[PDB]
Amino acid sequence: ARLAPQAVLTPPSAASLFLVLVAGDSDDDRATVCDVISGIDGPLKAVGFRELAGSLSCVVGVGAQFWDRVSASSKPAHLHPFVPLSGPVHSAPSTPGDLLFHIKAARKDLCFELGRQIVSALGSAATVVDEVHGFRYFDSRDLLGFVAGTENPTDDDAADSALIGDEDPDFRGGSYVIVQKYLHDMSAWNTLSTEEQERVIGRTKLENVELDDDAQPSNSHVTLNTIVDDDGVEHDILRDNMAFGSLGEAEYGTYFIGYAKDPAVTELMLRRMFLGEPPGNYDRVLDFSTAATGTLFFVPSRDVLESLG
Amino acid sequence: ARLAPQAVLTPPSAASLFLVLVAGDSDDDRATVCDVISGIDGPLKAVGFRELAGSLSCVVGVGAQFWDRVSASSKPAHLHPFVPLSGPVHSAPSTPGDLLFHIKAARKDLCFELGRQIVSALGSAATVVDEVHGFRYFDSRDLLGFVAGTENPTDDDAADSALIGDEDPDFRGGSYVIVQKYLHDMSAWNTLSTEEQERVIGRTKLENVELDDDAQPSNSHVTLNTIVDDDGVEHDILRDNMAFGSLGEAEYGTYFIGYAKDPAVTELMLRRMFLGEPPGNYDRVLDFSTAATGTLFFVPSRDVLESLG
Amino acid sequence: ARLAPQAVLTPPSAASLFLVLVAGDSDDDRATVCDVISGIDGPLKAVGFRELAGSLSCVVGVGAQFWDRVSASSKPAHLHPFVPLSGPVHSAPSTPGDLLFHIKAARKDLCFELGRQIVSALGSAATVVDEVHGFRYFDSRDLLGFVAGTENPTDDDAADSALIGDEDPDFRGGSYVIVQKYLHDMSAWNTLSTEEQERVIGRTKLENVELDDDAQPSNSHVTLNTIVDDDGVEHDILRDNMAFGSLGEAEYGTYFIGYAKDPAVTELMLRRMFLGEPPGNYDRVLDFSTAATGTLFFVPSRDVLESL
Amino acid sequence: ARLAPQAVLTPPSAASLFLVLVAGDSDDDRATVCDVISGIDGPLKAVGFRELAGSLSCVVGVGAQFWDRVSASSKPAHLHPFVPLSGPVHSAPSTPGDLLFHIKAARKDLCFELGRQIVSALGSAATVVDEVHGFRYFDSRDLLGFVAGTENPTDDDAADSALIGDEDPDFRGGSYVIVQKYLHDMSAWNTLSTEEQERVIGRTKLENVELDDDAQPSNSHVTLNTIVDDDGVEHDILRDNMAFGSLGEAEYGTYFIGYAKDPAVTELMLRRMFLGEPPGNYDRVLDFSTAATGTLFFVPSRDVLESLG
Amino acid sequence: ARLAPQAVLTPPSAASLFLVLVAGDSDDDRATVCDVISGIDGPLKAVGFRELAGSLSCVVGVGAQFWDRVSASSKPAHLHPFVPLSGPVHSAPSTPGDLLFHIKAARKDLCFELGRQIVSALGSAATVVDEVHGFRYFDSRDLLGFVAGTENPTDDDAADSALIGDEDPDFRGGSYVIVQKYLHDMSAWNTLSTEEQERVIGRTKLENVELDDDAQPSNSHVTLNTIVDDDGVEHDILRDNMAFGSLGEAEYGTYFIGYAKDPAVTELMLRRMFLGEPPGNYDRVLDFSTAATGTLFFVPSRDVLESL
Amino acid sequence: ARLAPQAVLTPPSAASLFLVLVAGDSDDDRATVCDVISGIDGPLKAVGFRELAGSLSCVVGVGAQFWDRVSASSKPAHLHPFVPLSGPVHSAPSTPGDLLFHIKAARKDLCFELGRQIVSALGSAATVVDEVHGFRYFDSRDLLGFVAGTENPTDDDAADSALIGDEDPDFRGGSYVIVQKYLHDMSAWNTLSTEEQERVIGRTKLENVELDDDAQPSNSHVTLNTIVDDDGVEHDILRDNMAFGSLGEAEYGTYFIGYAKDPAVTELMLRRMFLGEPPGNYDRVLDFSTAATGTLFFVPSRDVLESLG
Ligand code: HEM
Ligand code: HEM
Ligand code: HEM
Ligand code: HEM
Ligand SMILES: [Cl-]
Ligand SMILES: [Cl-]
Ligand SMILES: [Cl-]
Ligand SMILES: [Cl-]
Ligand SMILES: [Cl-]
Ligand SMILES: [Cl-]
Ligand SMILES: [Cl-]
Numbered sequence A, B, D, F: 001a002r003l004a005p006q007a008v009l010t011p012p013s014a015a016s017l018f019l020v021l022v023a024g025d026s027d028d029d030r031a032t033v034c035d036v037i038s039g040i041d042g043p044l045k046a047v048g049f050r051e052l053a054g055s056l057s058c059v060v061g062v063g064a065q066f067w068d069r070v071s072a073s074s075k076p077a078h079l080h081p082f083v084p085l086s087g088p089v090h091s092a093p094s095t096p097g098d099l100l101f102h103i104k105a106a107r108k109d110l111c112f113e114l115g116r117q118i119v120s121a122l123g124s125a126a127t128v129v130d131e132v133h134g135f136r137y138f139d140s141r142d143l144l145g146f147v148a149g150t151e152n153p154t155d156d157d158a159a160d161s162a163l164i165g166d167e168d169p170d171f172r173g174g175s176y177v178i179v180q181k182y183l184h185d186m187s188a189w190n191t192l193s194t195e196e197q198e199r200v201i202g203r204t205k206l207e208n209v210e211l212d213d214d215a216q217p218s219n220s221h222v223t224l225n226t227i228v229d230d231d232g233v234e235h236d237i238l239r240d241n242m243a244f245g246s247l248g249e250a251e252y253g254t255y256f257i258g259y260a261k262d263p264a265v266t267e268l269m270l271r272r273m274f275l276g277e278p279p280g281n282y283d284r285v286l287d288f289s290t291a292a293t294g295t296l297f298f299v300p301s302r303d304v305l306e307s308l309g
Numbered sequence C, E: 001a002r003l004a005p006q007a008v009l010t011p012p013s014a015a016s017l018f019l020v021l022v023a024g025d026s027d028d029d030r031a032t033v034c035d036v037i038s039g040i041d042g043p044l045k046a047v048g049f050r051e052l053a054g055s056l057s058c059v060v061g062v063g064a065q066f067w068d069r070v071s072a073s074s075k076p077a078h079l080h081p082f083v084p085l086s087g088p089v090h091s092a093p094s095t096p097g098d099l100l101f102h103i104k105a106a107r108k109d110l111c112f113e114l115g116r117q118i119v120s121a122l123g124s125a126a127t128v129v130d131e132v133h134g135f136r137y138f139d140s141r142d143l144l145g146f147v148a149g150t151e152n153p154t155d156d157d158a159a160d161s162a163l164i165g166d167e168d169p170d171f172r173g174g175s176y177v178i179v180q181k182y183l184h185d186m187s188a189w190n191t192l193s194t195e196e197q198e199r200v201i202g203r204t205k206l207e208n209v210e211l212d213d214d215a216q217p218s219n220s221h222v223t224l225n226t227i228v229d230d231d232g233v234e235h236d237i238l239r240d241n242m243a244f245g246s247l248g249e250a251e252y253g254t255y256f257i258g259y260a261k262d263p264a265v266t267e268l269m270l271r272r273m274f275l276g277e278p279p280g281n282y283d284r285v286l287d288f289s290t291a292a293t294g295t296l297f298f299v300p301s302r303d304v305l306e307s308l
């Protein structure tokens, strides 16, 4: 898929732009927004075509809110605002956002330039609330120094885990994406030993090998984020997390972003993480990282997105 | 589609070679031509395999006259010679050619070497009448200075536009391709201002953005080459244009090469360009660009190409 | 096909690792091997995910004997051990192997690391019996100096040639791989003129152009390995050969590895090469190449592999 | 020069980190700072070595201020705080900074990681005041869409323009660097025509050709920034400007950073720019860009830097 | 040596452009040419700065006649027009050229753009008389199939070979370039066996290994082009040859371009090639290659060029 | 230093080949050896020229015994056989070799092909006694998992450390090189914890940071291999180590290869490693690493190498 919007299954990139906007209530504002997103291939190609490789992509997400202002008579089975969470020790907020632009490419400039054009073409119809500049950190690691994205599904597995299928035929090819902008306590995480961090995560640090069944804490991030139903079948998400940061504000982030054909799966994950399972037995990763955003979007197929207004 | 002939859908490349030949009148000549072209996979792999990336591609096209010499009793539905056009100041001549080899690669040497092996296999059975060595010019710009190919369709839309379908099943997967070798008047074009040049084209020069509707001349290249039928269905073509030129002979060129499932679309675009819409409202790009060739070829699918003889 | 096990159709790579292993006798050995190979995408992702490009792949093969030790319930239609061949001048031995890991990547480190992890996780449950580190040699050449892999099928022809289909649907998506480690007699090869070598292979050397029909000897490698059935349809295999060797031992090698949906095609190529067509008209490439191994494996699809 | 600090003459990079810090008054603070900078090759190599190419570099700059707290008995001929400017229309501030880290590399991660380690190793001894993440924007352009850095000197020319020579023998191999973090008025600049912008700058936009003597405004950025002494000899700086920005804050920047063997040259340039020459005839670029920082640093040779404390 | 004019010592590149021009008669022509060439680093930076890598280079050469039209005050010690050679079978013509632009870059677009700019800025003051777009061919080969440039001197030997020194200090840092556009007779070359071609060149074809002393013919290109003085010291030139051609015209070419601090070395190679050593023992490469141009230029250092 | 033999200063590469040979006893053997090695530029270019980047390099080294057979009456000042060491549990054996070819390239095939041509030119006049195919392992790490070569000197410092100077003018520009082929006990090493492994080495594992003084064991690899003379002058060596190994034979290796103007420095480092400082305080890396070879070679400059015979 070269320079098509709503390409959910694109592999990891060296650079990322995550843009979250809220729209004006204005019916002008709402129509401008609809011109821009419904013709998103326009700027995508306009920018992306300028690089031989065509690495640029752009997934547009529409919040449950704004989706209702533009398509009253039609709705995907699982679209809703982000379910906030209140656990024993840690809390997942549910912040504002109508529009998500998930931009990826082999270079920063291509990313930013597409962002410049999307923002410029929306003028006053929308306002940027969250902006993360994602980046690859060494051999695909988060700023906690672990290889990040290892166990994502691929090929058919990824398509099945992430894209709306027969189960909701009106919106085939779409997805539900949840973002959370985590900031990290670097000095705290650094007081742990490698082995403790490995215990927290679920896998060895340098070698990125998953720990044995008998060495794996019942509250390792891995165990918490593994989902098996009654019949014995696993359910996966597709994560496109990037690192970001600012040195003189001491921010060191993991930008979480997970796509799934049904947000139930992501949501259960988030519950097992914040509330724990057994309850109270929560995800130790949360000790070292706090969510500062939390938002859910529907990712329309190319067709659905092209008809809006 | 790695090292397969008739890969119409290949993304743009850094180098290309376009060869147009005329076949000898003889029965020998016809048979040699058929062997070489029906067996084009041989040279394709012989050269292309030597590069790890396998970037080399080769699309063979056959003119209407030569087709009738070779397969009298089976003809793709829309194969006819190039339709010349004559406006009051600018014309599209119809120039000879029985064979097109449209060759693309990441490097010159690959395109050249394949050309050599093809020309050599053809020996005296065919004669080159046009030869153009295409090259990528900065960030996918043409010699007029504009990003070039921005609006080409990709993925499914590309297949939908370029490749014969249910309409003409005996040749599904083939295409119709048109070439025109345009030379530019750089002087005249340079005496325009950027803002005028943009008005000629239909997009901003540097940033490659489409001009919005109320700033968009009715005889802009973009506008004139937009094809919406009465039912409001858009009809696209697939363009693999490349810069080319010679400093000593002051040639600065654009090699037009457009693929379509039905050449009616390409031909309509052309008639809107040369004869204007409404009539006399011609494409100002033609004030600065003069076509020296105009030839139409049928691009058979692999199975059809392999059967020839 | 990013970071998936059993990706038979991957394009060529700069580096590869061919690992052949024998499994231990015990039921415990059986289970450790089965546990490792069934979860192969674990290590495959553990190392592969670390390279932006995602070039790393890993095809697992299972030999007939070991397949029987895990699944006498159903067998791929053509799975059997490798058939030795004993020709008038040269022979192709049949040699042990229970498991094959055919690993490809853009970098040696990735192949090596994935191997390290696989070999480690198998521990005493298995023994490496052959190991060769392949590498690309100039413009896709082999150590004999010829461009090597030119006429592989690609795209659909590749899938039609290599992947088991309707003809054996319980194992749809798998394949049959045959491997042979060849060592060359370099001085003997260099006593030939370029023209003689071209007549041996059946293509020109520098340019890699097929010799035409009447300059083509009947015993050219290319002729002997052309398989056309009674209806005129050609049957192709998919070869992922790499160069290897060792300067100190004077080993200059071609690692042959050929995938096919029906290994009789590959086997018939072998018979025509070793015994000749007509008999005695054997492949003169064999006058400069001696095969030190010979092993056949079934390549389960992801589904069947995951269930093992 | 692979992985050596104070490598002033390294060619352009795809990524940049500009860090400006101020030090604590604390004599601990001052000694920590001196350990970190005097052993700067330590973290440079620690990070840089991890990339085969070794693209990472780091120039340390020491403000005139702090330089005096650490080397009382020795001073470079032209070290002083940044001379602020007050012109007819526009003003160049002179902001705080003791330490400059000019970091460059082929990737973001390498940049940031070196920054992480420099900041972490300074702990509370210093505080980040300015942090710019530089990036390459297309074919070496600033966010004003012009090719940026064209006329820099190279080879010997660059060494002579930038490195302290015979004229101040104690500090041979060092440099004076001035930074200014400009923000741009994008909507204003976009109301000009290409030709007007060309007039402002001095060179053609797309083609990056310098205008003819007779077409060149006496107040084009180029003319203002050309320096010729009494004898007829030119004097050049070496600029390593990068683009940066933030979309939802509408910041679009040129991070200016010029090295010279004598800041007189940079300073005269800045005067001709802000005050004009003839006076009042100032640099039109200033209409569309405002300096939000202004700081001057001495760049010690490797030897001088290694002995500090 | 990033984006500087007169960088003779640049390594090989994927693409090059060779432009030969004649200047107009008028004094106005003289001044426009001089203005353009003296400011050559303007366009060189205007296009070159646009590529991150900075691969673009541009060497300017000035012919003897035009040099005289601008500087009869001082002449490089060896500057004279190219000497035609008329041998027993083959001849090297002397053909017009007042200016040479030898442009190299990693990409065609850069070479082309710099040429566009140069040719434009010269307008009617000059005329392009020869233009060839060179390209790398496989693993540094020429269209005859041999690796081409193997024995160029490098590093210091390169500077010692190519750059004018103490022997003519008013022009320290310059050089002398000779260019000849050769066209090959491909069918004739292909009637030779590989062994015959190797004996012509003096190296093996695929492997690019020098033939040893007793398999080396006396009229091998390599032998004829070895220049050893009476004290035993070898004298080398620096060649930046590229392939070119046109499929429709059947032109398959080698663009010869040789730099030396003293062009008698290059000239003596030419005489030994065209007339033979001993006489009549000429270079059999010339039985397959015909030179269509022949021109000598002085390559001013940056300083002398800037002052023109 | 493009395609020149004896380029000791080459930056690290992705592939290498180390060959150690013993010369035949004969006069023929000696003369063949001298021809091949004095003419090594031939094979170097023959192979290396075929790659555009020209990454291929080849450094020839000559052992003390063979040197004395070849140039009896002229000997670099410090050429002697490798000095064996025997600690109580760990030893450095002294193993045969008259010739070293240290070959580096960006690709395996280049290193291999050069090796072939060299081994073939030598024929029966020499026999390979050690052959190692080095490869870059992730981000310049060795098989123990640590970034490896971090502290090598670069630029002038490298030249200063590695290359014979005024001390021994007849051989200025040469060097002395020592090789040791170490095999690791991966099991034993893996039973350590990261923090212990770091203590063994002297730097953090993942982030490659030097441990500060008060956390830095006196028998850390780093500490023991730091060489300060009485005058406080540091003495460095240049290391081109590479990973290597064989999965079937459970070999996981580090090929040590250190260059020095004076081997006294390398030999002292070694004696501090094997015999400890103070005595018995040995380098714990040796608990996990066992050397199978130990050979010293003189690396002549080009002019000297070319004269041999
Ligand atoms: C601070 C934020 C986070 C960090 C630093 C983090 C880091 C990790 C790491 C190091 C792994 C192991 C390697 C891999 O497969 O990617 C992992 C796996 C995973 N993570 Fe998290 N993660 C974070 C937040 C989350 C959140 C909020 C979710 C769910 C909404 C989540 C879902 C998963 C899933 C589904 C896997 C695959 C586990 C498996 O099946 O083996 N991650 N992440
Ligand atoms: C004469 C030389 C030509 C030049 C310099 C030229 C230039 C351009 C440029 C700069 C664009 C905008 C970027 C893009 O989407 O490709 C464009 C678009 C287009 N051109 Fe042309 N062109 C030429 C000949 C033609 C011809 C002969 C045809 C039709 C037969 C044509 C059909 C199109 C089409 C279909 C588009 C996309 C229109 C849209 O839907 O936005 N081009 N061309
Ligand atoms: C908003 C800030 C600025 C922008 C966007 C800007 C942009 C430019 C552009 C487009 C050029 C022409 C191409 C080139 O050679 O780089 C240029 C040249 C130059 N600039 Fe500026 N510039 C800025 C600030 C400055 C400042 C503050 C100085 C002096 C302190 C300066 C010194 C120069 C010099 C010395 C040249 C070379 C001119 C020549 O000799 O031809 N720039 N800059
Ligand atoms: C046995 C296998 C070996 C392993 C795994 C090993 C590992 C290391 C590592 C991980 C470093 C830190 C990164 C760096 O600066 O290179 C290091 C530094 C060093 N190593 Fe070793 N090494 C080995 C053998 C040796 C030997 C035999 C010597 C001396 C003859 C040695 C001399 C050094 C030196 C001089 C440094 C830099 C010390 C400093 O000044 O910080 N290495 N080595
Ligand atoms: Cl961005
Ligand atoms: Cl995650
Ligand atoms: Cl071509
Ligand atoms: Cl077009
Ligand atoms: Cl390996
Ligand atoms: Cl084969
Ligand atoms: Cl950064």
Ligand SMILES: [Cl-]
Binding pocket: D239, D241, D256
């Ligand atoms: Cl500037």
Ligand SMILES: [Cl-]
Binding pocket: E016, E017, E108, E111, E112, E115, E133
């Ligand atoms: Cl060109």
Ligand SMILES: [Cl-]
Binding pocket: E239, E241, E256
């Ligand atoms: Cl030559």
Ligand SMILES: [Cl-]
Binding pocket: F016, F017, F108, F111, F112, F115, F133
């Ligand atoms: Cl090797």
Ligand SMILES: [Cl-]
Binding pocket: F239, F241, F256
């Ligand atoms: Cl070491």
